[PDB]
A paper describes a structure:
UL31 is a soluble nuclear phosphoprotein whereas UL34 is a type I membrane protein containing a single C-terminal transmembrane helix. Together, UL31 and UL34 form the heterodimeric nuclear egress complex (NEC) that is anchored in the INM and faces the nuclear interior. Composed of the viral proteins UL31 and UL34, NEC deforms the membrane around the capsid as the latter buds into the perinuclear space. In HSV-1 NEC, oligomerization into the hexagonal lattice is essential for budding.
Interestingly, the nuclear budding defect due to the DNUL34 mutation could be suppressed by an extragenic mutation in HSV-1 UL31, R229LUL31, which arose during serial passaging of the DNUL34 mutant HSV-1 virus on a UL34-complementing cell line through directed viral evolution [reviewed in]. We refer to this mutation as SUPUL31. To obtain a high-resolution view of the hexagonal lattice formed by the NEC-SUPUL31 mutant, we crystallized the NEC185Δ50-SUPUL31 and the NEC185Δ50-DNUL34/SUPUL31 constructs, the mutant equivalents of the previously crystallized WT NEC185Δ50 construct (UL31: 51–306 and UL34: 15–185). The NEC185Δ50-SUPUL31 structure was refined to 3.9-Å resolution. Nonetheless, the NEC185Δ50-SUPUL31 hexamers looked very similar to the WT NEC185Δ50 hexamers, with similar hexameric interfaces. The lack of the R229UL31-D129UL31 salt bridge in the NEC-SUPUL31 structure correlated with an ordered 129UL31-134UL31 loop. Importantly, some of the new contacts at the interhexameric interface were mediated by the 129UL31-134UL31 and 261UL31-268UL31 loops that were ordered in the NEC-SUPUL31 but not the WT NEC structures. Therefore, in the NEC-SUPUL31 mutant, there were new contacts at the interhexameric interface that could, in principle, stabilize the NEC lattice in the presence of lattice-destabilizing mutations.
Residue numbers in the entry:
A (entry chain E), B (entry chain C): 14 to 178
C (entry chain D), D (entry chain F): 54 to 306
E (entry chain H): 54 to 131, 135 to 306
The structure:
Amino acid sequence: PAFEGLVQRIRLIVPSTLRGGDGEAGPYSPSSLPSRCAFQFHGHDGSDESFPIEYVLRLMNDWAEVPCNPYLRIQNTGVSVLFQGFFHRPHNAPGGAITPERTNVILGSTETTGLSLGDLDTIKGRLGLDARPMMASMWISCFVRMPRVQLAFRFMGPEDAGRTR
Amino acid sequence: PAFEGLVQRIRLIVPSTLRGGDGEAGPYSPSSLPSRCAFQFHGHDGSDESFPIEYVLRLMNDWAEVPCNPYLRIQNTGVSVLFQGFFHRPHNAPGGAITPERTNVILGSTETTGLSLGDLDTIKGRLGLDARPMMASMWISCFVRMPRVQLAFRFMGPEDAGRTR
Amino acid sequence: CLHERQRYRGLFAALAQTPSEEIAIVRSLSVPLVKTTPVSLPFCLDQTVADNCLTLSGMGYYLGIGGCCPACNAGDGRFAATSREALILAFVQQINTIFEHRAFLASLVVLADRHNAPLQDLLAGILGQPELFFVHTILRGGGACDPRLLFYPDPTYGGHMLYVIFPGTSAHLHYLLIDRMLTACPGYRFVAHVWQSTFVLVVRRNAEKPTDAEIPTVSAADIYCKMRDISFDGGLMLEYQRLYATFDEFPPP
Amino acid sequence: CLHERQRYRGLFAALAQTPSEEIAIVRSLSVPLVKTTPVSLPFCLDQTVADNCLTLSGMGYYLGIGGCCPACNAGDGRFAATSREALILAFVQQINTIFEHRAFLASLVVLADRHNAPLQDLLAGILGQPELFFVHTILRGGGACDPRLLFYPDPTYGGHMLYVIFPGTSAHLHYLLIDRMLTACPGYRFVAHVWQSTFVLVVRRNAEKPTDAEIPTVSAADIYCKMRDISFDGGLMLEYQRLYATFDEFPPP
Amino acid sequence: CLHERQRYRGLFAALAQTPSEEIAIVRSLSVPLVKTTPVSLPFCLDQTVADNCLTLSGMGYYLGIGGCCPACNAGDGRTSREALILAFVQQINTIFEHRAFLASLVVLADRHNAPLQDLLAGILGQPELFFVHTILRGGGACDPRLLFYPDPTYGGHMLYVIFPGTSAHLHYLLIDRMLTACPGYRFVAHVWQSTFVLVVRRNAEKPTDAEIPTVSAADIYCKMRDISFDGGLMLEYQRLYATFDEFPPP
Ligand SMILES: [Zn+2]
Ligand SMILES: [Zn+2]
Ligand SMILES: [Zn+2]
């Protein structure tokens, strides 16, 4: 029942190069979820870095005990890439801008995109990838070369089998 | 059971700079609600004051014992801003704060806007603010300039504890 | 949504017997729960109510309540408020404060060399619309923050539009500054935008010249000569050349 | 999304107790399950993110992760002398290295003879757009998949657009290769296409980006003289004549 | 309509038995329960019934039953085309009665540097403007100001009645006489730069017979050259023209 515990966990999971982690959502409990970004990361020019979108969204859904659809938003902004994490789908923002066979996406100045956990799971199922736990996790590989930000939503997998009971 | 009691209470709640009230309050019973504004306030040139919309609308619903949807309307007339309070929709525009991402609104000469209590509750729920009594009330910050009148729908909260049970 | 308002009706009734506590509660509800509002560029400053600041940065484009925003709460020392009369005084006395308006004149010289044209007529034409000089004066800040200024021909209208170039990766427009900019220059529209990873504020003509026509006349020949005897710093001129070369291909918003 | 919450709650809770194992596991999720992504011709390279290579062949038009595709991993050594400055050096040094970059000059000669135009003016016009020469230089195994080059007048604004002809029934563009192509010449657009069972990469203008600010001046007359002094291979000239005749009726994508 | 029929059947039958009381009741229903009707600018006065007055103010844009507007009820003193024509003809003798009209004309002549003889001939060619001027300058009025601007489409000169202050109450008798005296002219209320205005333009071509006698423009021009106008009024008209020079006519 720790709102800041989730943000700390997410910051741990996200690589260090993605400067950020601020709340910007106010006090929120697993029952009461905000409409503001729970976490906010940002990268500078040349931040050829990866973001574990599936892991963070599934973790957000785990922490909350109310039905929801965690959502990530990516903005090329004007000088730096901006990742935002909302507990519920925002409005005025493109929903499913990640369609199968369209892993590559480009973002010009002030442009935006995003993805919800429902759309992520549906796309994962359509591709027929392994739905078992930790057998297929999505990763957003972002290259920020101004004025553009080039994203690739690639499903990366495990290297072993670990403990499965 | 006070026909004038509601308008007097509202006048108490509204700041002094919004000269008005005691006007256009057509004869109305708690069961029979009118289609005319129960209160009419107005401000002169250079008034930079706030209006507690949520409190006024909730009070309007309080006085009436029949299902209704209290509504506020704000009109720039070119020479003075006028706030009017109708018990049922005057068939005007739903609102500007209907889009949680467009809290700011400007009104030129003869322009109009408004908001219903249903839209207020919808925006309050979408923003995820605290639904406890008097923990999140919307306020219309109005700045009256010569050509235009600039209003902002900001959700303000309490500064202490209600001391309630 | 009725019975929630009824569960507030009970409270309203209990409070009605003691109006003092009611007024106390109503006045105690003065802490905005929504401080930052997301905005998306291009954004016109006409939609900025008083007591609203604009924070364009890599962390986002967002508007903030002027009373709660930290940098606004520090206020940069207020610097009072340039009265319209004082702005006219500065426009007239520009000749004696050549250093206080060095960026403006240096941009004019760089443009005069850029279009291989004379500087005196260009200066006379730019000063004919003093609202740009007013904007320069208003947004002038002590220290680096001292904003740069470019001048470009205005399509669909008769004159010259302005590009306020803010250096760095962030730009915070104070609520008082933008409010006074919009009030001092009524006939000009201000729109924030981004170009080549640089935040910019485009000032163009709007509403078909709703501006005072009694603006006093300043001699361009005397200022031209005073520029001819004063040598500008090569660094500022080179920076203005670079900014002009980068913004020569900028779609006006 | 409740089934996900159910079958993942136990795992997430068990991971919360040991953050080290969590970081290790998440960092261990670096094995792409989808290496090949389908592409559809005509395809513009602007949609190619870094770390993406293009395999256009009879087996399909597909993009591949630069890290897993075999041929990309088995590069041509450390040919990392692809800096814009070094490309400018090669552009200026063209006069003394006429023997290399032979396809470029042979294509220019063939075009000059086919359209009865002067060779000095053609050299001056093609040299005015050094981005085409930069593209030629990057794509140079010097025989190892040495791409051919056709030059055709450019519609709209532009002197001459370029057609990079890839010989054979297959073409693999390295991810670093595509990235450097897009970065060195930003104002030019690259579109892959096929014509008469021959793969082609069309290079056209997309903005005024000749970099006249940093463009070196190279004498076109001296290159013209050195070309008139060297005898070109008849095979290259005949091949370019055939390529021009085949591509003379090609709708530019 | 079954509920209405059943709840009214008893009353209707009882009244049928006594027609006198029925007539009394029906005639006793003469108390309007809806006095103010909201209007929205731009508003054309053609939609104003004879017994309707306009109280355009900051507290709202509202029309009122001519029988109930308070100031209207105190409009006891307060007529048609006839006296308006007589005044238009005698304009040469009443320069003091129409100072705003002629002073606005002089200021306009200076604003466009045009000749006063041609301006006088053109303004006298549209006597409906003089009729409006006379109507609005009532007994103990607040002399509403009057500007003259060239008229597009239809050719001549349109009028801008500038109402001073932050409120404007147009009497129902005033509106009726304005609409009847100028049939071919359209009147539209609006607001500009926080100033209420009434625009008078040409309408329906030329549905205005010329039964108006001929008035000499040269004599009026000379008498104006002989009368010295009060300072400040000319400056006020200059300011009004400068402020309204950028006004899109509604
Ligand atoms: Zn601020
Ligand atoms: Zn490859
Ligand atoms: Zn009246």
